[PDB]
Coordinates of C-alpha atoms and ligand atoms in Angstrom, one line a residue:
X3 CA 77.8 266.9 42.4
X4 CA 74.0 267.7 42.1
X5 CA 73.0 270.8 44.1
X6 CA 71.3 270.1 47.4
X7 CA 67.4 270.1 46.9
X8 CA 65.7 272.4 49.3
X9 CA 62.2 271.5 50.4
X10 CA 59.8 274.4 49.5
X11 CA 58.9 276.6 52.7
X12 CA 55.0 276.0 52.8
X13 CA 53.0 278.8 54.6
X14 CA 49.3 279.4 55.2
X15 CA 47.1 280.9 52.5
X16 CA 44.9 284.0 53.0
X17 CA 42.2 281.6 54.4
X18 CA 44.7 280.1 57.0
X19 CA 44.9 276.8 55.0
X20 CA 47.7 274.6 53.6
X21 CA 47.2 271.8 51.2
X22 CA 49.2 268.6 51.1
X23 CA 48.8 266.1 48.4
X24 CA 50.1 262.6 49.0
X25 CA 51.1 261.0 45.6
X26 CA 53.3 258.6 43.6
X27 CA 56.0 259.9 41.0
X28 CA 59.2 258.9 39.8
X29 CA 62.7 259.9 41.1
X30 CA 66.1 259.1 39.6
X31 CA 69.0 257.7 41.7
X32 CA 72.5 257.1 40.2
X33 CA 71.0 257.0 36.7
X34 CA 68.1 254.6 37.5
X35 CA 64.4 255.8 37.9
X36 CA 62.5 254.3 40.8
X37 CA 58.8 254.7 41.7
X38 CA 58.7 257.1 44.8
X39 CA 56.1 258.8 46.8
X40 CA 56.1 262.4 48.2
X41 CA 54.1 265.2 49.7
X42 CA 53.4 268.0 46.9
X43 CA 55.8 266.2 44.8
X44 CA 57.6 263.0 43.8
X45 CA 59.7 262.5 46.8
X46 CA 60.0 263.7 50.4
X47 CA 57.9 266.9 51.0
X48 CA 57.8 270.6 51.9
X49 CA 58.7 272.3 55.0
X50 CA 55.4 273.3 56.6
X51 CA 55.9 276.5 58.4
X52 CA 53.9 277.4 61.5
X53 CA 53.9 280.2 64.1
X54 CA 53.3 279.7 67.8
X55 CA 49.8 280.9 68.9
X56 CA 48.3 280.7 65.3
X57 CA 45.9 278.0 64.0
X58 CA 46.2 276.5 60.7
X59 CA 44.0 274.1 58.7
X60 CA 45.8 271.3 56.7
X61 CA 43.8 269.8 53.9
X62 CA 45.3 266.5 53.1
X63 CA 44.6 264.7 49.9
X64 CA 45.3 261.0 49.7
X65 CA 46.4 260.3 46.1
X66 CA 47.7 256.9 46.7
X67 CA 46.0 253.8 45.9
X68 CA 46.4 252.6 49.5
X69 CA 45.5 253.9 53.0
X70 CA 47.9 256.3 54.8
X71 CA 48.0 258.6 57.9
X72 CA 50.0 261.7 58.6
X73 CA 51.7 262.1 61.8
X74 CA 53.2 265.4 62.9
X75 CA 56.4 264.0 64.8
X76 CA 57.1 266.5 67.7
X77 CA 54.0 268.4 67.7
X78 CA 52.0 269.0 71.0
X79 CA 48.4 268.6 69.5
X80 CA 45.4 266.7 70.4
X81 CA 45.2 262.9 69.6
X82 CA 42.5 263.8 67.0
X83 CA 45.0 265.5 64.7
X84 CA 48.1 263.4 65.7
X85 CA 47.7 261.2 62.8
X86 CA 48.6 257.9 64.5
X87 CA 47.4 254.6 63.0
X88 CA 43.8 255.6 63.7
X89 CA 44.0 258.6 61.5
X90 CA 43.1 256.7 58.3
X91 CA 43.1 258.8 55.0
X92 CA 41.2 256.6 52.3
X93 CA 42.9 256.4 48.9
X94 CA 41.3 259.2 46.8
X95 CA 40.0 260.8 49.9
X96 CA 40.5 264.2 51.7
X97 CA 41.0 264.8 55.4
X98 CA 41.4 268.2 57.2
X99 CA 43.2 268.8 60.4
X100 CA 43.3 271.8 62.6
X101 CA 46.9 272.6 64.1
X102 CA 46.7 275.0 67.0
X103 CA 50.3 275.5 67.5
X104 CA 51.5 276.1 71.0
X105 CA 55.1 275.2 71.8
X106 CA 58.5 276.6 71.4
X107 CA 60.3 277.3 68.0
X108 CA 61.6 274.0 66.7
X109 CA 62.2 271.8 63.6
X110 CA 59.8 268.9 63.9
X111 CA 58.6 266.7 60.9
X112 CA 55.9 264.7 59.5
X113 CA 55.5 261.2 58.0
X114 CA 53.0 258.4 57.7
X115 CA 51.9 256.1 60.6
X116 CA 50.0 253.4 58.8
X117 CA 49.3 250.5 61.0
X118 CA 52.1 247.8 60.1
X119 CA 53.2 249.7 57.1
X120 CA 55.0 252.8 58.5
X121 CA 58.5 251.5 57.3
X122 CA 57.4 250.8 53.8
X123 CA 55.6 254.2 53.5
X124 CA 58.6 256.2 54.7
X125 CA 61.0 254.1 52.7
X126 CA 58.8 254.8 49.5
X127 CA 59.6 258.5 50.0
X128 CA 57.0 260.1 52.3
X129 CA 58.5 262.6 54.8
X130 CA 58.2 266.4 55.1
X131 CA 59.4 269.1 57.7
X132 CA 57.8 271.3 60.2
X133 CA 59.4 274.8 60.9
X134 CA 57.8 276.2 64.0
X135 CA 58.7 279.9 64.9
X136 CA 57.7 281.9 67.8
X137 CA 58.4 285.4 69.1
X138 CA 61.7 284.5 70.9
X139 CA 63.9 282.8 68.3
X140 CA 63.7 285.6 65.6
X141 CA 65.2 288.1 68.2
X142 CA 68.4 285.7 68.1
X143 CA 69.5 286.6 64.6
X144 CA 70.5 283.1 63.8
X145 CA 71.2 282.5 60.1
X146 CA 67.7 282.5 58.6
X147 CA 67.8 282.7 54.8
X148 CA 66.0 279.4 54.0
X149 CA 68.2 277.2 51.5
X150 CA 71.1 279.5 51.5
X151 CA 72.4 279.8 55.2
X152 CA 69.5 278.1 56.9
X153 CA 69.2 274.6 55.4
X154 CA 67.2 271.4 56.1
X155 CA 69.3 268.2 55.9
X156 CA 67.2 265.3 55.8
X157 CA 69.5 262.1 55.8
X158 CA 68.2 258.7 54.9
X159 CA 69.5 255.4 53.4
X160 CA 67.8 253.2 50.9
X161 CA 68.3 249.9 49.2
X162 CA 67.5 249.4 45.4
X163 CA 66.8 246.3 43.3
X164 CA 68.7 245.6 40.1
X165 CA 65.7 247.2 38.2
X166 CA 66.2 250.4 40.1
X167 CA 63.2 250.2 42.2
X168 CA 63.3 250.8 46.0
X169 CA 64.0 247.3 47.5
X170 CA 61.8 247.3 50.7
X171 CA 60.8 244.3 52.8
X172 CA 59.2 243.6 56.2
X173 CA 60.7 240.2 56.8
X174 CA 62.4 238.1 59.6
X175 CA 65.6 240.0 59.2
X176 CA 64.2 243.6 59.0
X177 CA 61.8 242.9 61.8
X178 CA 64.8 242.1 64.0
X179 CA 67.4 244.5 62.9
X180 CA 65.5 247.1 60.5
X181 CA 65.4 248.1 57.0
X182 CA 68.7 249.6 55.9
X183 CA 70.5 250.0 52.6
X184 CA 73.8 250.8 51.0
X185 CA 72.9 254.2 49.3
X186 CA 72.7 257.6 51.3
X187 CA 70.4 260.3 50.4
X188 CA 70.4 264.0 51.4
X189 CA 67.2 265.6 50.7
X190 CA 66.6 262.8 48.2
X191 CA 70.0 263.4 46.4
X192 CA 73.2 261.3 46.4
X193 CA 76.2 263.3 47.8
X194 CA 74.8 266.9 46.9
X195 CA 76.7 269.9 47.1
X196 CA 75.4 273.2 48.9
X197 CA 76.6 276.6 48.2
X198 CA 77.0 278.3 51.8
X199 CA 77.9 282.0 52.5
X200 CA 81.0 282.8 54.4
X201 CA 80.1 283.4 58.0
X202 CA 77.7 281.0 59.8
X203 CA 75.9 278.1 58.3
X204 CA 72.8 276.6 60.1
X205 CA 71.8 273.0 59.4
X206 CA 68.6 271.5 60.5
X207 CA 69.6 267.7 60.7
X208 CA 66.9 265.1 60.6
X209 CA 67.8 261.4 60.8
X210 CA 65.1 260.1 58.5
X211 CA 66.3 256.6 58.3
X212 CA 64.0 253.8 58.9
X213 CA 66.6 251.9 61.0
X214 CA 70.1 253.5 60.7
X215 CA 71.7 255.6 63.5
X216 CA 73.9 258.4 62.4
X217 CA 76.9 260.4 63.7
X218 CA 77.6 263.7 62.2
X219 CA 81.0 265.3 61.9
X220 CA 82.9 267.4 59.2
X221 CA 85.6 266.1 57.1
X222 CA 88.1 268.4 58.4
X223 CA 87.0 268.0 62.1
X224 CA 85.7 271.5 62.3
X225 CA 83.4 271.6 65.3
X226 CA 79.6 271.7 65.2
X227 CA 77.6 274.2 67.5
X228 CA 74.4 272.3 68.6
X229 CA 71.7 275.0 69.1
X230 CA 68.5 273.0 69.1
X231 CA 67.1 269.4 69.7
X232 CA 63.8 267.7 68.9
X233 CA 61.6 270.3 70.6
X234 CA 63.5 273.5 70.0
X235 CA 66.4 275.6 71.4
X236 CA 68.8 274.4 74.0
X237 CA 69.6 277.1 76.7
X238 CA 73.1 277.9 75.2
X239 CA 75.2 276.3 72.2
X240 CA 76.9 273.0 72.9
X241 CA 80.1 272.7 71.0
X242 CA 80.9 269.2 69.6
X243 CA 83.4 267.4 67.3
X244 CA 80.6 264.8 66.5
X245 CA 76.9 264.5 66.8
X246 CA 75.0 261.0 67.2
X247 CA 71.4 261.3 65.8
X248 CA 68.9 258.6 66.3
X249 CA 66.1 257.8 63.9
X250 CA 63.5 260.5 63.9
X251 CA 65.7 262.9 65.9
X252 CA 66.5 266.5 64.8
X253 CA 69.4 268.6 65.8
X254 CA 70.1 272.2 64.6
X255 CA 73.8 273.1 64.4
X256 CA 75.8 276.1 63.3
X257 CA 79.1 275.4 61.4
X258 CA 81.7 278.1 60.9
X259 CA 82.3 278.9 57.1
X260 CA 85.5 280.8 57.8
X261 CA 87.6 280.2 54.7
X262 CA 87.0 279.3 50.9
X263 CA 88.0 275.7 51.2
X264 CA 85.2 273.1 50.5
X265 CA 84.6 270.4 53.2
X266 CA 81.9 267.6 53.7
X267 CA 79.4 267.1 56.3
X268 CA 80.0 263.3 57.0
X269 CA 78.6 260.5 59.0
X270 CA 80.8 258.3 61.1
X271 CA 80.4 254.6 61.6
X272 CA 78.1 253.5 64.5
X273 CA 77.9 250.6 66.7
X274 CA 74.5 249.1 65.6
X275 CA 73.8 245.8 64.3
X276 CA 74.0 245.8 60.5
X277 CA 74.9 249.4 60.2
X278 CA 78.7 249.2 59.8
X279 CA 78.6 247.2 56.7
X280 CA 80.4 248.8 53.7
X281 CA 80.3 251.5 52.8
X282 CA 79.3 252.6 56.3
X283 CA 82.2 250.8 57.9
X284 CA 84.1 254.1 57.2
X285 CA 83.2 257.7 57.4
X286 CA 80.6 258.3 54.9
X287 CA 80.1 261.8 53.0
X288 CA 76.7 263.3 53.5
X289 CA 77.0 266.6 51.5
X290 CA 79.8 268.8 50.1
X291 CA 79.7 272.3 51.4
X292 CA 81.1 275.0 49.0
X293 CA 81.9 278.4 50.6
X294 CA 80.6 281.4 48.5
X295 CA 80.9 285.0 48.9
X296 CA 77.3 286.3 49.1
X297 CA 75.5 288.3 51.8
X298 CA 74.9 286.6 55.3
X299 CA 74.4 288.1 58.6
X300 CA 73.6 285.0 60.9
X301 CA 75.6 284.8 64.1
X302 CA 76.0 282.2 67.1
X303 CA 74.6 283.9 70.1
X304 CA 76.1 283.3 73.6
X305 CA 72.7 282.4 75.1
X306 CA 69.9 280.9 73.1
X307 CA 66.8 280.3 75.6
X308 CA 65.6 279.9 79.1
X309 CA 64.0 276.4 79.7
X310 CA 62.0 275.4 82.7
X311 CA 63.8 273.4 85.5
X312 CA 63.1 269.6 85.6
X313 CA 60.1 269.0 87.8
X314 CA 60.6 267.6 91.3
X315 CA 60.4 263.8 91.3
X316 CA 58.6 263.5 94.6
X317 CA 55.1 262.1 94.1
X318 CA 55.2 261.8 90.2
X319 CA 53.3 258.9 88.6
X320 CA 55.8 256.1 87.5
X321 CA 55.0 254.2 84.4
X322 CA 57.2 251.3 83.4
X323 CA 57.5 250.3 79.7
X324 CA 59.4 247.1 79.1
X325 CA 60.6 246.7 75.5
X326 CA 61.2 243.0 74.4
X327 CA 61.6 241.0 71.3
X328 CA 60.7 237.4 70.8
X329 CA 64.0 235.4 71.3
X330 CA 63.1 233.4 68.2
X331 CA 63.0 236.8 66.2
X332 CA 66.4 237.8 67.6
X333 CA 68.2 234.6 66.6
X334 CA 66.3 234.0 63.3
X335 CA 66.9 237.7 62.5
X336 CA 70.6 237.5 63.3
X337 CA 70.8 234.2 61.3
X338 CA 69.6 236.0 58.1
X339 CA 72.0 238.8 58.7
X340 CA 75.1 236.7 59.1
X341 CA 73.9 234.6 56.1
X342 CA 73.6 237.7 54.0
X343 CA 76.7 239.6 55.0
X344 CA 78.9 237.3 57.2
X345 CA 81.2 238.4 59.8
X346 CA 80.8 242.0 58.5
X347 CA 77.3 242.1 60.0
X348 CA 78.8 242.4 63.5
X349 CA 81.3 244.9 62.8
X350 CA 81.8 247.7 65.2
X351 CA 79.7 245.6 67.7
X375 CA 54.9 234.8 63.3
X376 CA 57.5 237.8 63.4
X377 CA 54.7 240.3 62.7
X378 CA 53.8 240.4 66.3
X379 CA 57.1 239.4 67.9
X380 CA 58.1 242.9 69.2
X381 CA 56.6 244.1 72.4
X382 CA 55.9 246.4 75.0
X383 CA 55.0 245.0 78.5
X384 CA 54.7 241.7 76.9
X385 CA 52.2 242.9 74.4
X386 CA 52.5 243.5 70.7
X387 CA 50.7 246.7 69.6
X388 CA 46.9 246.3 69.8
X389 CA 45.1 249.2 68.2
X390 CA 41.9 248.7 70.1
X391 CA 43.3 248.7 73.7
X392 CA 45.1 251.6 75.0
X393 CA 47.5 250.4 77.6
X394 CA 46.6 253.1 80.1
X395 CA 45.5 256.8 80.6
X396 CA 48.2 259.4 81.3
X397 CA 47.4 262.5 83.2
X398 CA 46.7 265.7 81.5
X399 CA 48.8 268.8 82.4
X400 CA 50.9 266.7 85.1
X401 CA 54.5 265.6 84.8
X402 CA 54.9 261.9 84.9
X403 CA 58.2 259.9 84.9
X404 CA 58.2 257.1 82.4
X405 CA 60.9 254.3 82.8
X406 CA 61.7 252.7 79.5
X407 CA 63.7 249.5 79.7
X408 CA 65.5 247.7 77.0
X409 CA 67.2 245.3 79.5
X410 CA 66.9 241.7 77.9
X411 CA 68.0 242.7 74.5
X412 CA 70.9 244.5 72.7
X413 CA 69.0 246.1 69.9
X414 CA 68.8 249.9 69.6
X415 CA 65.5 251.6 70.4
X416 CA 65.0 255.3 69.9
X417 CA 61.9 255.5 71.9
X418 CA 59.3 258.1 70.7
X419 CA 56.3 259.4 72.7
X420 CA 53.6 261.3 70.8
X421 CA 51.9 264.5 72.0
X422 CA 54.8 265.9 73.9
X423 CA 58.2 267.4 74.3
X424 CA 59.7 265.8 77.3
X425 CA 62.9 266.1 79.5
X426 CA 65.4 263.2 79.7
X427 CA 66.2 262.4 83.2
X428 CA 68.5 259.5 82.4
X429 CA 69.4 258.1 79.1
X430 CA 70.5 254.3 79.0
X431 CA 72.3 254.6 82.4
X432 CA 73.5 258.2 82.7
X433 CA 72.3 261.7 82.9
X434 CA 71.8 263.0 79.3
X435 CA 74.6 264.7 77.4
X436 CA 74.3 268.4 77.4
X437 CA 72.8 268.8 74.0
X438 CA 70.2 266.1 74.8
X439 CA 69.3 267.6 78.2
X440 CA 66.6 270.2 76.7
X441 CA 63.5 269.4 74.8
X442 CA 63.4 265.9 73.4
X443 CA 60.6 263.8 71.9
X444 CA 63.0 260.6 71.6
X445 CA 65.1 258.9 74.0
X446 CA 67.8 256.2 73.6
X447 CA 67.2 252.7 75.0
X448 CA 69.8 250.1 74.3
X449 CA 70.2 247.3 76.7
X450 CA 69.6 249.6 79.6
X451 CA 67.1 251.7 81.1
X452 CA 66.0 255.5 80.4
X453 CA 63.9 257.9 82.4
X454 CA 61.8 260.6 81.0
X455 CA 59.8 263.6 82.5
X456 CA 56.8 263.9 80.3
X457 CA 53.7 266.1 80.4
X458 CA 50.8 266.1 78.0
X459 CA 49.3 269.5 77.4
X460 CA 46.5 268.2 75.1
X461 CA 43.9 265.5 75.1
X462 CA 43.6 262.1 73.1
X463 CA 40.5 259.8 73.3
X464 CA 40.5 256.1 72.8
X465 CA 39.5 256.7 69.3
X466 CA 42.3 258.7 68.5
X467 CA 45.0 257.7 71.0
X468 CA 48.6 258.9 71.3
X469 CA 51.3 256.3 70.5
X470 CA 54.4 255.5 72.2
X471 CA 56.8 253.3 70.3
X472 CA 60.5 252.3 69.0
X473 CA 61.2 254.6 66.0
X474 CA 63.1 251.8 64.4
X475 CA 60.2 251.5 62.0
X476 CA 60.3 247.8 61.5
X477 CA 60.1 247.3 65.3
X478 CA 57.1 249.4 65.6
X479 CA 55.5 247.8 62.7
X480 CA 55.9 244.2 64.2
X481 CA 54.4 245.2 67.6
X482 CA 56.8 247.6 69.6
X483 CA 54.0 250.3 70.3
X484 CA 51.4 251.1 72.7
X485 CA 48.5 253.5 72.6
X486 CA 47.6 255.6 75.5
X487 CA 44.8 258.2 76.2
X488 CA 44.9 261.6 77.9
Ligands
CU501 CU1 55.7 261.0 66.6
CU502 CU1 63.3 248.9 68.6
NA503 NA1 76.2 280.4 77.1

């Protein structure tokens, strides 16, 4: 098996700057070369390392021949640097943003947010990681040797043409159910192996799929110890046998490497339209882990962090966000799926503006509302009226989930989150915005099934 590629850990220079170049190159997948896009490379991108309380300047060079934007998913930053659809970087052009990092240690990420083209641009290869550290997490003595016992694991599906090229389309089927493929990549590689020291192994898991939800486990059912969600450390580890992960979510887990036997990280079949088609109808390997006897000192602590209590609900502003899809899209989309795959498509169970929030397809010129600054609000996000999956992402914030799709959040989902599950039911988040966003550089809130977002399931808001 190819060894697991490790994104380079990219830190500030002597002048407190970092450079990111967005460009096209070539990658090879199962023998065939394909045109791919990457940050500082051909595919995917580096892990940008930031420290809480320290400002960095990022110089972004768009070396594509089309426009793009750069969104820091999970970062509590002003709208001006948030890199939503209004953050255009012209082809051949350079844009610089200042990130004044002020949030707990977390694994966040970054990716394009081009208006109507976000799905395509991510599918082409654009994504990178953000490793935020603070004064608290380094006290914990977690595994910390980057690319040895502290390893990013970015999992993504793709579909390829006969000629080997990435086979991406925004059409009626994908507008409805998403873009998904038959080939699983792990940091850009197909079924790689990673050499992990005996002791504790830390995985920073990112579901970087456009539309595919995942569910991590191990081939021999050894447990995962969840230590962190989107926006950082949980209060204490949560021990699980499997870990569902929605599109754009991150969890950090420890896994015990307590003998010499190789095992796989795997993903288990999910109940989502289109996602349990072969070979995802069965547990699917993600990467092979090969235990090795080299130095490690990482441990699993009893106690990780202390988070604030949930705010009192009395007197909070309530915002209702109703998600919907044009009936025609739903049936048309389903028709194409059934035509393409047949009964397998339901196993485990103008379209360009057919996806909506509060009866409106995204209008870039009209923020739906102004949210309060520095005050908790309760946002109620409903998917009642359809049975599609919607990982709902709110920019500019790490929030607390009050209810997820009908129930209190699972323990490992009760900490800091930038995404909440909405699937035929209603969710509630308690959300606070510590930074401003004007109408000209508004925050986005949207489904992170990218083809839904691209076809209207998004709103802008100011702070
Ligand atoms: Cu985001
Ligand atoms: Cu959606
Ligand atoms: Na504990």
